[PDB]
Design a protein around this ligand. Structure first.
Ligand SMILES: CCCCCCCCCCCCCCCCCC(=O)OC[C@H](CO[C@@H]1O[C@H](CO[C@H]2O[C@H](CO)[C@H](O)[C@H](O)[C@H]2O)[C@H](O)[C@H](O)[C@H]1O)OC(=O)CCCCCCCCCCCCCCCCC
Ligand SMILES: CCCCCCCCCCCCCCCCCC(=O)OC[C@H](CO[C@@H]1O[C@H](CO[C@H]2O[C@H](CO)[C@H](O)[C@H](O)[C@H]2O)[C@H](O)[C@H](O)[C@H]1O)OC(=O)CCCCCCCCCCCCCCCCC
Ligand code: CLA
Ligand code: CLA
Ligand code: CLA
Ligand code: CLA
Ligand code: CLA
Ligand code: HEC
Ligand SMILES: CC1=C(/C=C/C(C)=C/C=C/C(C)=C/C=C/C=C(C)/C=C/C=C(C)/C=C/C2=C(C)CCCC2(C)C)C(C)(C)CCC1
Ligand SMILES: CC1=C(/C=C/C(C)=C/C=C/C(C)=C/C=C/C=C(C)/C=C/C=C(C)/C=C/C2=C(C)CCCC2(C)C)C(C)(C)CCC1
Ligand SMILES: CC1=C(/C=C/C(C)=C/C=C/C(C)=C/C=C/C=C(C)/C=C/C=C(C)/C=C/C2=C(C)CCCC2(C)C)C(C)(C)CCC1
Ligand SMILES: CCCCCCCS[C@@H]1O[C@H](CO)[C@@H](O)[C@H](O)[C@H]1O
Ligand SMILES: [Cl-]
Lengths: 342, 334, 34, 451, 81, 137
């Protein structure tokens, strides 16, 4: 059977400069629209009616302060379809109500699905194991938990991260003040996975580059490697002795070494995603009850834990009126927490 | 074979289970001193007047801390940058009140860890290796110098050095944001690119090499037994890896030279962390992140807020609350 | 010898055509006064 | 194209300047062309600063780093550091700019026109990196030049108008230095001071007599050692301790420059004698003490007894004791009590700040100086918004001390990395394994196993 | 290789540059005019410097209803006189 | 909203005469204020003495009143304490003390009017932000 399905399959999988594939039907429009939506919004679209903020090059923001901001809190978790009951097919209103945000988030989510399908598709055609796709589940877990599950647990999309450099920084600081997110052990594991991944990246790169075999005469050692050579280009035996004597332990199985390099950052991101699922419900690691009972009763008891809560309280009271304008917070000067003088 | 030559041949011997070396002669006593003091102080040290206002902060386990809240507390603001060894105190009880232990730990640690870097150079010379693994280690080492030494120098006190503890780290980071807006500094942003990128490329390289392992095992055994320590032949097919990844993106976005690939793995996080360290070190001298507070103004002159101004609101709350009893005059100039 | 209109040609231009248009729009914004 | 591709030289283009290692004639050109770049920047930057300079604003409000260097030497300024004549700034810039063309000319000639190697053309200018006698002789020539340079500063100070003295009675003035400190216990005593708070190593030099006498000692020492290294060749203990190669020599200098960059970073951050605050703005310690002083003065004028005002913590609101008893300013500036400055020292007694002088002898010029330095604290953003990170836009200011300190820390750090890079490579190249491990001779395969 | 013409071939060819010395500046100018004619403001609904606020008000025109949000913005736009 | 002549109309003196500044004067006032004054008065506060700000309500209760052009121009010539009892030229920049505050040497009478105008117009724009300090940033 060589029907139209099989002929289409032929064309989708041609060896061209940009492989397309069946996965490409999902991947390419969704990635392109998500990227074009972010560039369109950061260049031209305001956040005045949803946040009370300027947020586009048009308004005078720069690369650090432009954003595609989340919709107004009053939209709830609305899909905010262009043809939906809020914008009612009006493109200009849609932009003013935050329709670009759900547009980017949703085309982005389906774009990410399409990229991971692409990793499976190409891997099956070339004949390799699909571990690169398996590794990409960690970025997907992060995107889905932070940009979708987290706001879905909260009151509205407004509290999702906005798509911008400084807007994401605000998101970091909000998570410290309101959630005490540095205290959360699922974040701690994520930090370990990311910093340990960066560590493994640097050390393995440096170990290979400094246990190279002399396979050429030039002082530039890059030329003395051939992609189809059968020999290892660096000395596993010398690398193992160096680290055993510097550090006490070393790798001895190169297949374990590279699996571990997959394992560490991937597991870390997955752990951080679980903690954010909890924060969707405000199920925080905010306090240590034992510390609070002691400190309530003993005004001489002070730790770095109690000091940081005071900082969190400052963040909440000083940023909440501007950061949550729909709540209409009026905090007179006299209720604001402040140390002496400052 | 006199006794000095014998000692030198033992110190520099490549047959010791752990290499000693001349750097190791400094490294071992200083690291031992810093480690022993850290463990004892973390468990049992009494509270410490970090900010010099007779307001001691409890850092140890026996005085009410758990693993997450505990810390070795930085030395007193009254001491500033003065040297405070045990023998400058009238008693151990004084030394402990004033944060003596913090100085002893970090000075021994910074010495020991600098010698750790020299030791990496030294063993590579004895084994006939190329010498630059220690250049990769200079990036974490510079970062430790930034938060334990350079930042106190510029701010004028070891009491603004990073505490030796988990929650103390977070305190250091939060106050740093209030006083320098580090998130808006391009060197911290390059640092984030260094570690996010380094973790990305870590999983990238791990998954590609793992995806192209050459079949050497049955399905009931670990694929790891398909590699034998010291074997001459490579254990994966880099041509197949390049064939996959080149099609994932495009052909010329993919490495086929293992040497330049592994150099890129080395350089990206190391350079990024160098910039992170230089961020901390230059904000030590108060060259702070970008300030776009009230940068956008309308036709009449009303301030139009941006996300930068929301950051500023957060930073103010951090500023007005930190060290709540330590400021008498309106400007926190250091 | 070579074709002119390929998949690669389309991919290049869906990116490059809006980029130039946007760069002109952002260039003009540098002369807006309040 | 002698050694001008990767095949002939072994070095790729991105290490292309390594192709010069044994081409002394082209290497001379590279060095002379580069010195011209340095002299160019010095001349052009000065002219730029002068063009952009308004004499009624303090230098430190104008982004100036070179004019403060010239003014400190006593050119163009009078009492209080006021600018009386900008023509010396013009001269210094013009003469540097003109000279860079001479150096640019020599550099371009030797680099692309003259003899590629110098050994055939002249045995005086020729050299072999491994010739320990020729290398120490070239080193000796340059030590003599440096020694003369240090004596030019002495000549300016003692015979050609003097130096700007921030400490001069009457508010700061240019002063001829007639008795420079020659006592080697003073001069070399600076070298044995602790580098920690209250001591400050050589960064603590606080008077021009010591600055000038130190340059007399350094000039003599450099000239002597320069003669010594022309006449001698390295001894056996030195021969066995070092690597003798171009790259090795480069790496020693990189280590030395890195060390000096770190010292310069601290000099400009703490020292207000050879970096006068009139020109560079107040130090960080200085501005923080000036805030305490400003509010002691304000509150005392309103009727406060500042000696006995107990602050919220139990420590004095305005005044307290240092850990050794000296009377010092209170609040967070307690960390800065080691600060010494001309506007503050009149209030100082044997026991530290004197309450009687505080009550009766504070002059309006001290109130002025303290308010000016409190509001020009060296804090500001990368886009030059002055003040704490939470301040709003209005004031276009970053102190010269922050510019000079941050740039020289960054430079010193990378120069330390460069030392490690080239010292490690020099060692490996000398021993013969900088291109990789020889497969047939892998040293680890001849060693006993660890376990 | 995948069969398409090398990029270095194309972008050093006179014909490439004859075509693109027109199409590139023409797009740039189209983008400039999208802003300079004020059309970008009206397509996307972005305030001009003089239309964030009414002359004496200092409250944000914040959307507060889900299904009448369109009418709320339109009402905020009328009140600009 | 726009910078209108109404916004730019400010009290000239205590008797109720107004003067209408141009946009050029206002913008010149802002630049000269930044040049000579904002190091202590950024945003309408006073960093070396926060008890006294540049709010119009605060200026109206100074002695003599400073909430109009003539009072502010006189202050920049011969500043006084808030109750008028003392002359503070020796510690506050003014034309009288331009020898010790060199930045005042190149200010002309026209400049003083523009600075004065900026100080009186800005609260009409910024409201509580002017003289309010960090609470209103
Ligand atoms: C893994 C890889 C996956 C790859 C990516 C896949 C991308 C797919 C994209 C799908 C996007 C789903 C959009 C969900 C929108 C939503 O939920 O919208 C929410 C709505 C409910 O609407 C909300 O309802 C709330 C409760 O109201 C109720 O209570 C009110 C107050 O008392 C009133 O009574 C009111 O009338 C009554 O309706 C409020 O009204 C909110 O403002 C309103 O937004 O549910 C609904 O649409 C449907 C709810 C049922 C289905 C939920 C399943 C999907 C979500 C799972 C996440 C769990 C999150 C829980 C926290 C953890
Ligand atoms: C070969 C290598 C061998 C190694 C030797 C190891 C031995 C110890 C090393 C030194 C340790 C230094 C720690 C303290 C540094 C410091 O507090 O520095 C400050 C001092 C200056 O001291 C200050 O100096 C001041 C002097 O000013 C005084 O005098 C002035 C005169 O005008 C003014 O009046 C002023 O107001 C007044 O206070 C005061 O004394 C202060 O209290 C005092 O703190 O700097 C100085 O001594 C000079 C600068 C020293 C270098 C700074 C170290 C930087 C290292 C970076 C490493 C990065 C590595 C990365 C790895 C990858
Ligand atoms: C200060 C910076 C500096 C200096 C002084 C040099 C100097 C040199 N380089 Mg190096 N190099 C540098 C930076 C520098 N380089 C950088 C950044 C790179 C990376 C791209 C390299 C990569 C590199 C490689 C790969 C090679 C060199 C080589 C050389 C040498 C021969 C150059 C030649 O023959 O060109 C000939 C070029 C021309 C004739 C074109 C014009 C050149 C002139 C000098 C321009 C001067 C313009 C100036 C304004 C005129 C002023 C005149 C006025 C004063 C009267 C020369 C000594 C070569 C070498 O080692 O030979 C053995 C070599 O192969 N360099
Ligand atoms: C006096 C200082 C000095 C001197 C004379 C040398 C000389 C040399 N170096 Mg060393 N190096 C130094 C300092 C120095 N280095 C420092 C401080 C570092 C740490 C970063 C290094 C790190 C280093 C490495 C890693 C390597 C060398 C190498 C070399 C050799 C080849 C150099 C070359 O052709 O580069 C060519 C120059 C370039 C390709 C240009 C680099 C572009 C830089 C990064 C831009 C920097 C940005 C700029 C400051 C600001 C932005 C500008 C932009 C906005 C336009 C040559 C002998 C190579 C070697 O080992 O050979 C034996 C080599 O692999 N150097
Ligand atoms: C010692 C070096 C040094 C220092 C401390 C200063 C300091 C200053 N300059 Mg000067 N200047 C310098 C060198 C320096 N400059 C050089 C080399 C040039 C020629 C390009 C100039 C030309 C110049 C002009 C034309 C002007 C100044 C101005 C100023 C003032 C404002 C600076 C500013 O806003 O920067 C903004 C900050 C940046 C642009 C940050 C740059 C970040 C770099 C690219 C990072 C580099 C890192 C490292 C080097 C690379 C490592 C790479 C790694 C792979 C190894 C300030 C006093 C201004 C002024 O006020 O004049 C009165 C002014 O208009 N300078
Ligand atoms: C340190 C820098 C330096 C060094 C070591 C050399 C070395 C050399 N040059 Mg080069 N050259 C230089 C810089 C340098 N030059 C500069 C700046 C220029 C432009 C002026 C030239 C232009 C040049 C040309 C056109 C020629 C040379 C030639 C030579 C070779 C023979 C020169 C001779 O025998 O003079 C003998 C010594 C003297 C005549 C004494 C000169 C005293 C000077 C002029 C007075 C100043 C002395 C004082 C220390 C200067 C302080 C300057 C300081 C402030 C920067 C020799 C290898 C020749 C060559 O290559 O032959 C093939 C040749 O034809 N040079
Ligand atoms: C650029 C300057 C310079 C350079 C590169 C050299 C280089 C050299 N000198 Mg020369 N020397 C110089 C200036 C210089 N000298 C000057 C100005 C004088 C006159 C005072 C001398 C007088 C001199 C003599 C008498 C001798 C040398 C010798 C040597 C050779 C061995 C150096 C050595 O082993 O150091 C290593 C340094 C030491 C071994 C010092 C002891 C180690 C201490 C503990 C290190 C402490 C470091 C610590 C961080 C210090 C910080 C600052 C401190 C002051 C507080 C080497 C070629 C030797 C030689 O072979 O002559 C032919 C020799 O005998 N030099
Ligand atoms: C710090 C060195 C200052 C500079 C620069 C300027 N001013 Fe100032 N101002 C300062 C102080 C400490 C005070 C209080 C003085 C007192 O003891 O009463 C003031 C006061 C004023 C006032 C009076 C405010 C009021 O009465 O509410 C005005 C109108 C004023 N200052 C204006 C002003 C101008 C126009 C300046 C630039 C030319 C300027 N000041 C600079 C401190 C400092
Ligand atoms: C949304 C939407 C849509 C779409 C649209 C689109 C698709 C768009 C696209 C767009 C685009 C597509 C745009 C673009 C732009 C671009 C740009 C704007 C760029 C710029 C660049 C630059 C600026 C650069 C810079 C740099 C860097 C980055 C680095 C290197 C160096 C330099 C500096 C060069 C539709 C219609 C469907 C519907 C509705 C909605
Ligand atoms: C070798 C080489 C190189 C380098 C080069 C160089 C580095 C050079 C330099 C050069 C130089 C370094 C030059 C200089 C020049 C200068 C000049 C030419 C000047 C002139 C001047 C004048 C003309 C002046 C004028 C004036 C006056 C007198 C007055 C005031 C005003 C004015 C300014 C107008 C390269 C890398 C490229 C590569 C290749 C090789
Ligand atoms: C001017 C002045 C002054 C003076 C100064 C002086 C007098 C100085 C001196 C200086 C000096 C006098 C210095 C020295 C230095 C030294 C060094 C820096 C060394 C080093 C060493 C080394 C590096 C070694 C190494 C090694 C070892 C250890 C082992 C064996 C091998 C080797 C060799 C590698 C004063 C302050 C008064 C004042 C101000 C001005
Ligand atoms: C959804 C796709 C399901 C394939 S459907 C399938 O397509 C063939 C083409 O090969 C036809 O020949 C056949 O009649 C048709 O049923
Ligand atoms: Cl204080």
């Amino acid at each position: 059977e060589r029907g139209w399905f099989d002929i289409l399959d032929d064309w989708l999988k041609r060896d061209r400069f940009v492989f397309v594939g069946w996965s490409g039907i999902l991947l390419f429009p969704c990635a392109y629209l998500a990227l074009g939506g972010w560039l369109t919004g950061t260049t031209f679209v305001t956040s005045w009616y949803t946040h009370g903020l300027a947020s586009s090059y048009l308004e005078g923001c720069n690369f650090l302060t432009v954003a595609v901001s989340t919709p107004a809190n009053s939209m709830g978790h609305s899909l905010l379809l262009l043809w939906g009951p809020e914008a009612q097919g009006d493109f200009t209103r849609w932009c003013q109500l935050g329709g670009l945000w759900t547009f980017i988030a949703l085309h982005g989510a389906f774009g990410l699905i399409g990229f991971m399908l692409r990793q499976f598709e190409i891997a099956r055609l070339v004949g390799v194991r699909p571990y690169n796709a398996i590794a990409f589940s960690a970025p997907i877990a992060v995107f889905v938990s932070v940009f979708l599950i987290y706001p879905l647990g909260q009151s509205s999309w407004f509290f999702a991260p906005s798509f911008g450099v400084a807007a994401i920084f605000r998101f970091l600081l909000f998570f410290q003040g309101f959630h005490n997110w540095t205290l959360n052990p699922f974040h701690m594991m994520g930090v370990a996975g990311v910093l340990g991944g960066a560590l493994l990246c640097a050390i393995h790169g440096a170990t290979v580059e400094n246990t190279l075999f002399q396979d050429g005469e030039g002082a530039s050692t890059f030329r003395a490697f051939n992609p189809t050579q059968a020999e290892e280009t660096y000395s596993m035996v010398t690398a193992n002795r160096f680290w055993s004597q510097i550090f006490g332990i070393a790798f001895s199985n190169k297949r374990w070494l590279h699996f571990f390099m997959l394992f560490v950052p991937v597991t870390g991101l997955w752990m951080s995603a679980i903690g954010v699922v909890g924060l969707a419900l405000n199920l925080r690691s905010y306090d240590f009850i034992s510390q609070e009972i002691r400190a309530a009763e003993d005004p001489e008891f002070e730790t770095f834990y109690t000091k940081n809560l005071l900082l969190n309280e400052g963040i909440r009271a000083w940023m909440a009126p501007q950061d949550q304008p729909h709540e209409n917070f009026v905090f007179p000067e006299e209720v604001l927490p402040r140390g002496n003088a400052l | 074979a006199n006794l000095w030559e014998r000692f030198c041949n033992w110190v520099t011997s490549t047959d010791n289970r752990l290499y000693v070396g001349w750097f190791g002669v400094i490294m071992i006593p200083t690291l031992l001193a810093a480690t022993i003091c850290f463990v004892i102080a973390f468990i049992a040290a009494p509270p410490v007047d970090i900010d010099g206002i007779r307001e001691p902060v409890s850092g140890s386990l026996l005085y009410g801390n758990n693993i997450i809240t505990g810390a070795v507390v930085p030395s007193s603001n009254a001491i500033g940058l003065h040297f405070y060894p045990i023998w400058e105190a009238a008693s151990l009880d004084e030394w402990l009140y004033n944060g003596g232990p913090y100085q002893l730990i970090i000075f021994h640690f910074l010495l020991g860890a600098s010698c750790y870097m020299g030791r990496q150079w030294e063993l590579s010379y004895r084994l006939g290796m190329r010498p630059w693994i220690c250049v990769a280690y200079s990036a974490p080492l510079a970062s430790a110098f930034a938060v334990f030494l350079i930042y106190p120098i510029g701010q004028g006190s070891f009491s603004d050095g990073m505490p030796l503890g988990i929650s103390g780290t977070f305190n250091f980071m939060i106050v740093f944001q209030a006083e320098h807006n580090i998130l808006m500094h391009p060197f911290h942003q390059l640092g984030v690119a260094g570690v996010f990128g380094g973790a990305l490329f870590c999983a990238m390289h791990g998954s590609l090499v793992t995806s192209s392992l050459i079949r050497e095992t049955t399905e009931t055994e670990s694929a790891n037994y398909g590699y034998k320590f010291g074997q001459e032949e490579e254990t994966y097919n880099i041509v197949a890896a390049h064939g996959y990844f080149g099609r994932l993106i495009f052909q010329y976005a993919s490495f086929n030279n293992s040497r330049s690939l592994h150099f890129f793995l080395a350089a990206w996080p190391v350079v990024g962390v160098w910039f992170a360290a230089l961020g901390i070190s230059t904000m030590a001298f108060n060259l702070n992140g970008f300030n776009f507070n009230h940068s956008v103004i309308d036709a009449k002159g009303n301030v139009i807020n941006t996300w930068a101004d929301i950051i500023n609101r957060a930073n103010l709350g951090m500023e007005v609350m930190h060290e709540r009893n330590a400021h008498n005059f309106p400007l926190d100039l250091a | 010898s070579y074709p002119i209109f390929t998949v690669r040609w389309v991919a290049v231009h869906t990116l490059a055509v809006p980029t130039i248009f946007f760069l002109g729009a952002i260039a003009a914004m540098q002369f807006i006064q309040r | 194209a002698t050694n001008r591709d990767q095949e002939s030289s072994g070095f790729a283009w991105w290490a292309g300047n390594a192709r010069l290692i044994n081409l002394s004639g082209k290497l001379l050109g590279a060095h002379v062309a580069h010195a011209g770049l340095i002299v160019f920047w010095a001349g052009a930057m000065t002219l730029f600063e002068l063009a952009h300079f308004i004499p009624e604003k303090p230098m430190y409000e104008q982004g100036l780093i070179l004019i403060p260097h010239i003014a400190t030497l006593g050119w163009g300024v009078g009492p209080g550091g006021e600018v009386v004549d900008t023509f010396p700034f013009f001269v210094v810039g013009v003469v540097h700019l003109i000279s860079s063309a001479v150096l640019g000319f020599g550099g371009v000639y030797h680099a692309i026109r003259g003899p590629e190697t110098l050994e055939e053309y002249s045995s005086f200018f020729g050299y072999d990196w491994k010739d320990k006698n020729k290398m120490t002789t070239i080193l000796g020539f340059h030590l003599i030049v440096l020694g003369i340079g240090a004596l030019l500063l002495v000549a300016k100070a003692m015979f050609f108008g003097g130096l700007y003295d921030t400490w001069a009675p009457g508010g700061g003035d240019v002063r001829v230095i007639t008795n420079p400190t020659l006592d080697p216990r003073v001069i070399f005593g600076y070298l044995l001071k602790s580098p920690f708070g209250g001591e400050g190593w050589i960064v603590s030099v606080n008077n021009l007599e010591d600055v000038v006498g130190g340059h007399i000692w350094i000039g003599l020492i450099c000239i002597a050692g320069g003669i010594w290294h022309i006449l001698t060749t390295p001894f056996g203990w030195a021969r066995r301790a070092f690597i003798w190669s171009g790259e090795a020599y480069l790496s020693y200098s990189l280590g030395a420059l890195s060390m000096m960059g770190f010292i310069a970073t601290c000099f400009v951050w703490f020292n207000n004698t050879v970096y006068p605050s009139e020109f560079y703005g107040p130090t960080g310690p200085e501005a923080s003490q000036a805030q305490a002083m400003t509010f002691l003065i304000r509150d005392q004028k309103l009727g406060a007894n500042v000696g006995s005002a107990q602050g919220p913590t139990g420590l004095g609101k305005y005044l307290m004791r240092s850990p050794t008893g000296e009377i010092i300013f209170g609040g967070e500036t307690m960390r800065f009590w080691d600060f010494r400055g001309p506007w503050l020292e009149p209030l100082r007694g044997p026991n530290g700040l004197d309450l009687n002088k505080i009550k009766n002898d504070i002059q309006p010029w001290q109130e002025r100086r303290a308010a000016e330095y409190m509001t020009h604290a060296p804090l500001g953003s990368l886009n030059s918004v002055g003040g704490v990170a939470t301040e709003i836009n209005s004031v276009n200011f970053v102190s010269p001390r922050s510019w000079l300190a941050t740039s020289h820390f960054v430079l010193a750090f990378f120069f330390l990395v460069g030392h490690l890079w080239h010292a490690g490579r020099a060692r490996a190249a000398a021993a013969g394994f900088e291109k990789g491990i020889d497969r047939e001779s892998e040293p680890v395969l001849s060693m006993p196993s660890l376990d | 290789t995948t069969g398409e013409r090398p990029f270095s071939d194309i972008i050093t060819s006179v014909r490439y540059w004859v075509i693109h010395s027109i199409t590139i500046p023409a797009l740039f100018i189209a983008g400039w005019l999208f802003v300079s004619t004020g059309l970008a403001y009206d397509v996307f609904g972005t305030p001009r410097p003089d239309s964030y606020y009414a002359q004496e008000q200092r409250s944000i025109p914040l959307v507060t209803d889900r299904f009448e949000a369109k009418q709320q913005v339109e009402t905020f736009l009328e009140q600009l006189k | 909203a726009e910078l209108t002549p109404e916004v730019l109309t400010v009290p000239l003196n205590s008797e109720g005469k107004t003067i209408t500044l141009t946009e050029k004067q206002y913008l010149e006032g802002k630049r000269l204020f930044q040049y000579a004054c904002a190091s202590c008065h950024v945003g309408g506060i006073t960093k070396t003495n926060p008890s006294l700000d540049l709010r119009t309500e605060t200026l109206a209760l100074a002695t003599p009143p400073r909430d109009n052009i003539e009072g502010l121009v006189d202050y920049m010539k011969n500043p006084t304490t808030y109750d008028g009892e003392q002359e503070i030229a020796e510690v506050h920049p003014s034309l009288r003390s331009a020898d010790i505050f060199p930045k005042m040497r190149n200010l002309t009478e026209k400049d003083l009017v523009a600075i004065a105008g900026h100080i009186l117009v800005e609260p009409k724009i910024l409201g509580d932000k002017w003289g309010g300090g960090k609470v209103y940033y």
